[PDB]
Amino acid sequence: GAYKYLEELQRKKQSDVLRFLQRVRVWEYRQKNVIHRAARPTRPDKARRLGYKAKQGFVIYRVRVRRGNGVNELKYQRSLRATAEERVGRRAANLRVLNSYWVNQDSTYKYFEVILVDPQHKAIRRDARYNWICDPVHKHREARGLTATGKKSRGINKGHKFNNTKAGRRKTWKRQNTLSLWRYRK
Amino acid sequence: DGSDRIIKPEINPVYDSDDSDAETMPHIGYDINGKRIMRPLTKEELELISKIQRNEQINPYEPLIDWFTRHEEV
Amino acid sequence: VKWPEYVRVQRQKKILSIRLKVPPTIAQFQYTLDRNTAAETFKLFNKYRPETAAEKKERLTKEAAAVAEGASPKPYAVKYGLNHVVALIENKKAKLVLIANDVDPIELVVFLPALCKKMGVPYAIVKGKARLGTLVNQKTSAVAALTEVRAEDEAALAKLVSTIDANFADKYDEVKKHWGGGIL
Amino acid sequence: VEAMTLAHQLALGQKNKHDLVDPDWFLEDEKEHKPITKEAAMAIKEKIKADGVMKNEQRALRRIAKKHH
Amino acid sequence: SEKAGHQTSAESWGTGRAVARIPRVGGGGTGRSGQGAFGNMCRGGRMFAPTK
Amino acid sequence: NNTKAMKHALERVQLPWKKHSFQEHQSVTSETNTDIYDDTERELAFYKQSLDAVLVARDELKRLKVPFKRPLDYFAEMV
Amino acid sequence: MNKQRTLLISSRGVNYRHRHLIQDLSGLLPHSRKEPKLDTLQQLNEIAELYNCNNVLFFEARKHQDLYLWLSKPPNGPTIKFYIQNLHTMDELNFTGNCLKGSRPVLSFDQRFESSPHYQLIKELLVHNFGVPPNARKSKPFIDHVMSFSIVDDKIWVRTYEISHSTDISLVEIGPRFVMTVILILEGSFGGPKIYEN
Amino acid sequence: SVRKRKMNRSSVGKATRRNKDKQRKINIQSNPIIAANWDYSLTMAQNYKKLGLRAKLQTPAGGKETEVVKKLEELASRSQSEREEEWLEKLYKKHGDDYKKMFFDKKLNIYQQSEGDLKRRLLRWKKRNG
Amino acid sequence: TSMTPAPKISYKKGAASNRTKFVRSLVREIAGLSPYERRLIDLIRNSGEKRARKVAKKRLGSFTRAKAKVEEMNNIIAASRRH
Amino acid sequence: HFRKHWQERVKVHFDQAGKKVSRRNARATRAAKIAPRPLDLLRPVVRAPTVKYNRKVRAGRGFTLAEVKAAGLTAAYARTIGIAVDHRRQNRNQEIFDANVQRLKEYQSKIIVFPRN
RNA sequence: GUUUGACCUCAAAUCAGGUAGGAGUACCCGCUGAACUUAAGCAUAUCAAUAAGCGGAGGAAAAGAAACCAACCGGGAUUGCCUUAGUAACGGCGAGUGAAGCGGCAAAAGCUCAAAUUUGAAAUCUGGUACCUUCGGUGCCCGAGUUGUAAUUUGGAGAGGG
């Protein structure tokens, strides 16, 4: 499989070849609009390991997001990846956002490729391995931080390090800050 | 008593040309040995700063080396 | 005057590529096989075009009809799948490797020529992935190779490999020289 | 601006030389596309230079003030 | 009801106006305007010590 | 555990401090100052032990011409 | 003659109290080299060569409250696994005194250190480890602080005192103060057979 | 509420549903033998104990075989295609018991089946045929 | 008593999977060196590992990775300077 | 600890009886749908960590692969018979392993399996 | 070939059909987000990771089968209740904030891809048409796909053969 070679090459991003590729691609995307569709993914291995399939129904999109944040010191911890996912979802509300992967960045803007699946297409609806995305509960996954980046931002992970938000910080706060009274007082 | 080991040469604690540190009213203080210091950037640094400001820089255009691909796999 | 935005972007891309300095790994393409040897290679490959959907369906229907009323040799065809080709290469199974110079993702095929050189399998670069696709009943393939040539064409394949060696591997053995794209 | 900050950093022994090295329509984008110090910013800026109830409440407050003052 | 009595808007008329300092509903031209609210003494107001 | 290893380590690590001026040594052993739960007598004992070496170093520096007291014109950083 | 450099690194689990000691040690040891947190140990041999550090002060921490200081020389120096209990540092306000940063110290050693081979062995390392080269790059001329060492109840007590001259002189306690105990001693730098066990 | 107040006042009526009684008396629907012996008057645990089937494997919280014979009684109460049969007939009539020779028969043994598989198929063919 | 029941995923730390090692070597040859690896090799050519280790430590988060990077650079140099 | 608006969220468990009744009804429904089989899977006998409680012996998630193999069946087939199987639990006590094997053997004897059809 | 055709990129159709806005909003998932009030007057702190505002879902939602918890004769998806506990810990140890393993119970379901060639046959699928035993099935045809759709597989291994 050639995917291993692609994955190994993509790790050496600082390499001269990948540096030139990024220099060309950032200008190519900077000439295009902020949000523009991509005919095919620029990193087939990364998309494939993220659930991408070369079948009708899957769509690859590219979106540009500004970098940077004591007036401007306000953090506004909304992540750039989450903002890009939300923007592409809103522009493609009929589509569903699965995940996104880093493809390039610039001193002033960042670039991410996002994979979308159309639940209306019969191919996805008739596929047992992908029909789950058509469930209404999966509507606008990015809008609720259900994606990989969204889950990472929420800090939902096993272990003591994520006790505050092991199952949502708001839920834990509500549960802990509630007086429990039984019929027979303890 | 004792064990297998190699007696490595001693280490000289000399200060190299670069060690992340420099070397040392009517006066500007006192120098080493305690005597008063009576009162009285290089162009290369400015050039380097200007070059860095524009990402200007040895040659990266050397031919590739087929150190691994030269040996045909058997 | 004004021109379409996409037309302007693609036109400027050519100028940028010509003027921009590329690393030795890049520009290994466009040092393609000469027209005559590439034409001969395509002629040889055309004799081994894989069975198309229509022909395969016709053969299967004929076999079914024959069975309904009541031992061919191993099929021979060119291998073109990039994953399949890469799996055949590094196993010392492929005899001739063709690589397209206009693959949209350049990084997808930068390692293939070097990998073939390391494995010692003969390889060549030809202009246009569309030409490779046309002979395999596909839009594009970006690669093409032969694994089991018929005995009648074994000598022809050996002679073609020998010629390609000198034509490409020896003429472009210095492709690793000073970075390309150094045009005013 | 960052040039002045780098020069100021090089002025003191925090860093030295060893640490430093440790188409028109396209060049326009290239030209337009690190930590800074307040002291360096100030230095460069300087260098750039060429009723019933109411009455009862009032009486109660006056009594309280007299008792405590 | 936890919201009983709270579904009303009223404000005290300062002090020294020859009227009780109980907050009175604002508005006007409705009859209820100017009537006391939020007090146990007020008609239809919140009961003292609600039975939680 | 034996004194042989201690001797072997000392012979290789010990330096000839006694063959150089006090400025190169900067160490004084408090003679007869062989030093608990009181928390008051212990502090005074440590104070006297340090003061003995302080006086020894003061005398050693007085033997030299280098000034001992701070000139009062020195304003370097202080810990 | 006195040319040496001390390497200091923080072990995994170093807390604020140990960080205070590590930071205030540098203020009196200008020749010392400070490096970020390190963990498993043997890399110290390479780190010393990187910065030409003749001595290493590795603060091992088996727990997030206990502190274990290691004193040795990189190439072939013996190592002593100290254990510190009374973790008092400059953060305490009881040390109202102040000392010139980088000033040359005055070292005082208890006579009891010469009564046993182990005490003599540790004294040799302590003499130069806590000192400072006179004419080093970061050294300073004047002497304004004193380091004191004492041993009682089989445990060594570490103390320091500022020296103040009155218009003959008096000394005021300054710097960190703590007690240390010797756990293990090895013949080599973080290796070799055990030498002595307390 | 707003909608509820209008709905009661409206003449559209209500979608009256009564199923509280049916939520308790649930008829067993996963076995005929148990159903013919199950007693809805008793509880699930009581019914299981009467039938003998163990309701819970772990120790229950708090303090607490004719049918089994019927369950036991429940324990006591594919030929090769035409082409495959013809192929086995050819193999038998051309080679016989010479499995080693049949294995190397390039003509008939296009599929390089093992000797064990060939003999296993031949035994089934003999059982089903002459 | 001890039972040594069965292995786990941690037992799958076996050999380097020489195919993967070949892939990594090919990528390293084709990819080249990063802008900091270029400085590392340039200083190794004249200064040796002395400056290269410090540069790697400054770039990397720990010396454990710096020593591995220095070893990899030395291995690459050895083959390149002769093969 | 009343510096917050706790009065807004005062959860009183008035429902205890109704919740218990609903749980009993759910158990009855499961029995109706799972009549032949037990409501709960056969759990193993395990020893507790946290030495303060190691003296106590308590149930576990499921038997290990080694225990299932020693019991004379397979993990994949064991699940269909209601035997809980744990693919991450390692065996470290011979006494507990023998007890688990004996329990599995007894369970295999007590179970009766109807024809697949 | 002063030509014709392959591709790659980009356009328009009242092209054939689908998808989105919005409403409701007690509960759910994210972003944003203060003050009154409480303290040793007060910047740390408390009010509060609340009020209000914005975006996205259903009968529940999130999370969910450890790069976990533990230091034992070790436990083995997540979630919920008593206890752990007003303890550890945090807070000018100042008012105050404040957990989690284990223990008892409810429920207990596991799994799916990437990365080894179907290579002796892209065996995969949307769409249009003619029929039928019309929540869909068959023949025919253009297409999506080789920059990877079918089968198997996730260390609990797994794969090629007897």
From Swiss-Prot, chain A:
Q: Report residue spans for region: Disordered.
A: 146-167
GO BP annotations of the record are:
cytoplasmic translation
A Pfam family reported for this protein in Swiss-Prot or TrEMBL: Ribosomal_L15e
GO MF terms held by the record: RNA binding; structural constituent of ribosome
* Entry-linked PROSITE patterns: RIBOSOMAL_L15E
A GO cellular component annotated for this chain's UniProt record is: cytosol
Task: Tell me where on the tree of life, at the top rank, the source sits.
Answer: Eukaryota
Q: Where in the cell is it found?
A: Cytoplasm
Q: How does it assemble?
A: Component of the large ribosomal subunit (LSU). Mature yeast ribosomes consist of a small (40S) and a large (60S) subunit. The 40S small subunit contains 1 molecule of ribosomal RNA (18S rRNA) and 33 different proteins (encoded by 57 genes). The large 60S subunit contains 3 rRNA molecules (25S, 5.8S and 5S rRNA) and 46 different proteins (encoded by 81 genes).
Note in the entry: There are 2 genes for eL15 in yeast.
Q: Which PANTHER family match?
A: LARGE RIBOSOMAL SUBUNIT PROTEIN EL15, RIBOSOMAL PROTEIN L15
Q: Which family does it belong to?
A: Belongs to the eukaryotic ribosomal protein eL15 family.
Name of the molecule in the record: Large ribosomal subunit protein eL15A
The species is: Saccharomyces cerevisiae (strain ATCC 204508 / S288c) (Baker's yeast)
Q: What is the lineage of its organism?
A: Eukaryota, Fungi, Dikarya, Ascomycota, Saccharomycotina
From Swiss-Prot, chain C:
Instruction: Name its GO BP terms in alphabetical order.
Output: cytoplasmic translation; maturation of LSU-rRNA
- List keywords of the entry alphabetically: Cytoplasm, Ribonucleoprotein, Ribosomal protein
> What does the UniProt entry say about where the protein is found?
Cytoplasm
Q: Name one GO cellular component term.
A: cytosol
Specify where it is mainly localized.
cytoplasm
Q: What GO molecular-function term can you cite, just one?
A: structural constituent of ribosome
> Which family, according to the similarity comment?
Belongs to the eukaryotic ribosomal protein eL8 family.
Q: What is this protein's function?
A: Component of the ribosome, a large ribonucleoprotein complex responsible for the synthesis of proteins in the cell. The small ribosomal subunit (SSU) binds messenger RNAs (mRNAs) and translates the encoded message by selecting cognate aminoacyl-transfer RNA (tRNA) molecules. The large subunit (LSU) contains the ribosomal catalytic site termed the peptidyl transferase center (PTC), which catalyzes the formation of peptide bonds, thereby polymerizing the amino acids delivered by tRNAs into a polypeptide chain.
Which miscellaneous remark does the UniProt record hold? Present with 238000 molecules/cell in log phase SD medium.
Quaternary data? Component of the large ribosomal subunit (LSU). Mature yeast ribosomes consist of a small (40S) and a large (60S) subunit. The 40S small subunit contains 1 molecule of ribosomal RNA (18S rRNA) and 33 different proteins (encoded by 57 genes). The large 60S subunit contains 3 rRNA molecules (25S, 5.8S and 5S rRNA) and 46 different proteins (encoded by 81 genes).
Protein name as catalogued:
Large ribosomal subunit protein eL8A
- Its gene? RPL8A
Curated annotation (Swiss-Prot), chain D:
The record's comment on protein family reads: Belongs to the class I-like SAM-binding methyltransferase superfamily. RNA methyltransferase RlmE family. SPB1 subfamily.
| Subcellular localization | Nucleus, Nucleolus
What superkingdom does the record give? Answer: Eukaryota
What do we know about how this protein assembles, alone or with others?
Component of the nucleolar and nucleoplasmic pre-60S ribosomal particle. Interacts with the snoRNA-associated proteins NOP1 and NOP58.
Q: What does this protein do?
A: Required for proper assembly of pre-ribosomal particles during the biogenesis of the 60S ribosomal subunit. Specifically methylates the guanosine in position 2922 of the 25S rRNA at the stage of 27S pre-rRNA maturation. Also methylates the uridine in position 2921 in the absence of methylation of this residue guided by snoRNA snR52 at the stage of 35S pre-rRNA maturation.
Q: What is this protein called?
A: 27S pre-rRNA (guanosine(2922)-2'-O)-methyltransferase
Give the fragment's position in the full-length protein.
660 to 838 of 841
UniProtKB/Swiss-Prot annotation, chain I:
Q: Which GO terms describe its biological process?
A: cytoplasmic translation
Keyword Cytoplasm found? yes
Functional description taken from the UniProt entry: Component of the ribosome, a large ribonucleoprotein complex responsible for the synthesis of proteins in the cell. The small ribosomal subunit (SSU) binds messenger RNAs (mRNAs) and translates the encoded message by selecting cognate aminoacyl-transfer RNA (tRNA) molecules. The large subunit (LSU) contains the ribosomal catalytic site termed the peptidyl transferase center (PTC), which catalyzes the formation of peptide bonds, thereby polymerizing the amino acids delivered by tRNAs into a polypeptide chain.
Q: What is the lineage of its organism?
A: Eukaryota, Fungi, Dikarya, Ascomycota, Saccharomycotina
> Where, by residue number, does the polypeptide cross the bilayer?
none
Look up the domain of life of the source.
Eukaryota
Could you give one GO CC term from the UniProt record? cytosol
Its quaternary organisation is: Component of the large ribosomal subunit (LSU). Mature yeast ribosomes consist of a small (40S) and a large (60S) subunit. The 40S small subunit contains 1 molecule of ribosomal RNA (18S rRNA) and 33 different proteins (encoded by 57 genes). The large 60S subunit contains 3 rRNA molecules (25S, 5.8S and 5S rRNA) and 46 different proteins (encoded by 81 genes).
Q: What is its main location?
A: cytoplasm
Task: List the source organism.
Answer: Saccharomyces cerevisiae (strain ATCC 204508 / S288c) (Baker's yeast)
Per its record, how is this protein called by name?
Large ribosomal subunit protein eL36A
The GO terms describing molecular function are: RNA binding; structural constituent of ribosome
Additional remarks: Present with 31600 molecules/cell in log phase SD medium.
> Where is this protein found?
Cytoplasm
Keyword Ribosomal protein appears in the UniProt entry: yes
